[PDB]
Amino acid sequence: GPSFWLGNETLKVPLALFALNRQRLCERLRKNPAVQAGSIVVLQGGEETQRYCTDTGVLFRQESFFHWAFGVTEPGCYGVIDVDTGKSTLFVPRLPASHATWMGKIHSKEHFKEKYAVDDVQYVDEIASVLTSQKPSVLLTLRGVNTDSGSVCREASFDGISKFEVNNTILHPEIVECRVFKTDMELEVLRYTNKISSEAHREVMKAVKVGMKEYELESLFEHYCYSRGGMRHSSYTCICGSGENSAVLHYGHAGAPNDRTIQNGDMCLFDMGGEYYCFASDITCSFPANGKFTADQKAVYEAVLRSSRAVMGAMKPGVWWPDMHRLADRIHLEELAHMGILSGSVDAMVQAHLGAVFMPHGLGHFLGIDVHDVGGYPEGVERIDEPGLRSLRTARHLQPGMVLTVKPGIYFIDHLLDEALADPARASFLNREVLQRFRGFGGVRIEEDVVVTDSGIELLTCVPRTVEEIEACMAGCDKAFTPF
Amino acid sequence: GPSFWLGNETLKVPLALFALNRQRLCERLRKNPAVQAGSIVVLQGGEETQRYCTDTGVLFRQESFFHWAFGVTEPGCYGVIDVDTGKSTLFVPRLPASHATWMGKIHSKEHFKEKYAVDDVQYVDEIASVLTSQKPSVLLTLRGVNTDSGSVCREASFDGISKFEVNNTILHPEIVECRVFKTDMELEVLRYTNKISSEAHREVMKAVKVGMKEYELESLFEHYCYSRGGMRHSSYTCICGSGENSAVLHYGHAGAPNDRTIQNGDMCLFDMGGEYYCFASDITCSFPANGKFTADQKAVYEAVLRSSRAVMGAMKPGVWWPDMHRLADRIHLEELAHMGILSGSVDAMVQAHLGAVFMPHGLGHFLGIDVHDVGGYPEGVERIDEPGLRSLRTARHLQPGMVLTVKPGIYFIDHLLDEALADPARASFLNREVLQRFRGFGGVRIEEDVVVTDSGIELLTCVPRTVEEIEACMAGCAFTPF
Ligand code: PRO
Ligand code: PRO
Ligand SMILES: [Mn+2]
Ligand SMILES: [Mn+2]
Ligand code: NA
Ligand code: NA
Ligand SMILES: [O-]
Ligand SMILES: [O-]
């Protein structure tokens, strides 16, 4: 069948990938007691947008549920799926003649049918007529709450939909659950996004020089990803934190826009991941700006390397993800004590939630169509009300087919450290004489993308990780490393 | 005073630029007989957004009127200007403690006051209280219609604004008119955006090889602009049309995403412009993919070079922009006749609107903080309902301080050609046997950015333009990323 491809050495993605997602969704819905015969799933694609009130077009990126079901790159579409038969119909915009002048060829419906390997193609303005002719029992539309943003998914609507029976409660948890479990075809794409982003991270490590602006490496990363990988988008805004900025978890946004000059002695924390055909990657590399770890940098870095590898070694089906977070916390505390930053009983440190001072974010999250992927907190799964753990984006147990980021880190964040020092329950663990040395250090984060398998995990990411490997890469020796 | 700067060799932009814009706006408003004493201009800045229902942040780019007045890069702000005194107050978000963990330093109000060189800074949640104490007659807010998008400008609103008298009609025409005329400080930024984008176009011409994907050059262009120019954004989505795609005017969008392989014998039409601190550039270069113009390519290319230079040579204060568009049409028709594509009276061709078959878009437009800048069709300036001219984004007369793109082109667009061939009023001019050879040629566009001066224009763009210059540039043996 047909494939999405951007030529050169980019990945051919079979449109069969999306056909399989539609089949899986129907199979799940048919087993749902709330679903009656003759139901039709109705999804609305994203539309073109502009900057504010201007005619400056914003580059269109498809809505993630719609992409998952159809793989369609054009704005203004709808898509429906007959649950009982699996029959898929794509609705495409009926374009004005002038489109041919300004935007390009006005493709036929048959062109789109062949391109996307759907069963039928119709024009958007015909959706009420076409659905009326099929005499559905109920239309199943998308509405639910994203547990990372708090936003409500946009339910499909069209002229005449009020004449149909519409249910907007059934679909969301079911299509979310399908997205949680990646197919082998989806894993092929995520292997590829990790391949290209890993290569780009290695090029950045080779290119980094003291005196550069952070954004020079953002630019280089995205250029590798696009020109070599066909990744027109990143999965999220690049985080290129040097020096103290490496303690800022989502550094690089408009308010802190990767605009610091990299200094000798700084640590760098570069959290970047290209997106290919709306599939994510998320990789974080930490390294010394000048290519040589100091003793202090090595100690903090290897503490996080230890927790990274311990978690990857422990992950397998049945493991409760919050237990992996607590494992990372315990290892960070052990290593911070071994460094002289902390002293006393590590058991007592754990009981006092001291780990969250140094890692105030969740250990990792689902990854897929969205970098913070859906389904972390389905009904019944509760957020843990403790420091650090409350920021986990899932409290689920691991099962084969899930894709997770594993992103432990240690940071020196002044207001968190100062809170701890003001707190009798935590203050005694801290050795200020040693800690003062790490004020303004920033932090280290080491992030891998992995698949949960029957036997453990498959590591997708391929970047240098030991001190020796990283120093070699920065010296231009990027291939001299061996993944976990 | 303070300046915006992204280090290295990037441009230092004084915040005085925005203070001058605020002064100019107040001066204009004070002369408006409808404006009451004690009026306060109230603008609302852009807010952070995400992709659909996800938590995937979209990189924030400031709303253009707000940027013009304040130069503020942070989301979630408001800004007000006392019309009578010119006093400026910026309102910034009161951030939660956790911002320091996730997003960065929680700057003081004093930090923002010094950064932006405004008269005062307050928190957004105090805007009603602050405005109340100033006892304004009327709040002047922004509402009007953009004549390129047809969208309505988003009017400022805040909790408690209902307690004020608000006028949303006066401001828009006045702040639009101010934006039409660029200050010397604004022109310095537009010289810089043209400089970097010109350099990036030259690098692309040197890098193009047969067999590359169009998007490889989009990527290279944006990388040059960001890494060397500090241009995090482009002014618009890059248009990298090779072969027949060079006839597609806004090629490169998600539906036609710069994904063709460049072939031997193709013409390339690359329309790209980096954005610096929300100031635009817009440059188009046309050239043969293989570095050597054929006879047919040279003829079409030099026709557009001729109209480009003729229009630039005629531009000066008082010139009616639609007359320049018609000048370009007449030149294109003359040249297409010399080539043998057309035969007959060029006068009669013009009367039949044949020029619009080959150039269906407007000759050019205002450029500034938006690439299609505001103010092309103020009240009293009408759109001309004729082929080609109806797509002009302004029908104004030129005045000093206006910044315009000059972008003639000739394209071979099947459905326009087919219409013309069916129409007896136009078909007689077209020589089918010659035209057939140019089906699938694509097109040529040559686009310069210029400023109207007291006596003529100033050219901002600097790329190779003659056939000799282009061939020498592409044969050049500087920018090696990895
Ligand atoms: O938002 C999150 O969950 C991770 C934590 C470090 C940066 N991104
Ligand atoms: O939209 C416009 O006015 C110009 C025409 C060529 C492409 N951009
Ligand atoms: Mn990340
Ligand atoms: Mn242009
Ligand atoms: Na190096
Ligand atoms: Na900029
Ligand atoms: O991350
Ligand atoms: O253009």
CSV table of C-alpha atoms and ligand atoms in Angstrom, one decimal, chain A residues 239 249-250 271 361-362 365 372 391 393 407 411 445, chain B residues 102, ligand 1:
chain,number,residue,atom,x,y,z
A,239,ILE,CA,15.3,23.5,25.9
A,249,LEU,CA,13.0,22.6,33.6
A,250,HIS,CA,11.2,24.2,30.6
A,271,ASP,CA,16.4,18.7,26.0
A,361,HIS,CA,9.4,16.7,38.4
A,362,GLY,CA,8.1,13.3,37.5
A,365,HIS,CA,5.7,10.0,31.0
A,372,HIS,CA,3.3,14.2,26.9
A,391,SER,CA,4.2,15.9,39.1
A,393,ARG,CA,2.2,12.4,34.4
A,407,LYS,CA,14.2,11.3,32.5
A,411,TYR,CA,19.1,20.3,40.0
A,445,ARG,CA,19.0,15.5,33.2
B,102,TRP,CA,9.7,25.4,35.5
C,1,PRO,O1,7.5,18.3,32.0
C,1,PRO,C1,8.1,17.2,32.3
C,1,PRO,O2,7.4,16.3,32.9
C,1,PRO,C2,9.6,17.1,32.1
C,1,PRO,C3,10.4,17.3,33.3
C,1,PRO,C4,11.6,17.9,32.9
C,1,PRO,C5,11.3,18.7,31.6
C,1,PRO,N1,10.1,18.0,31.1
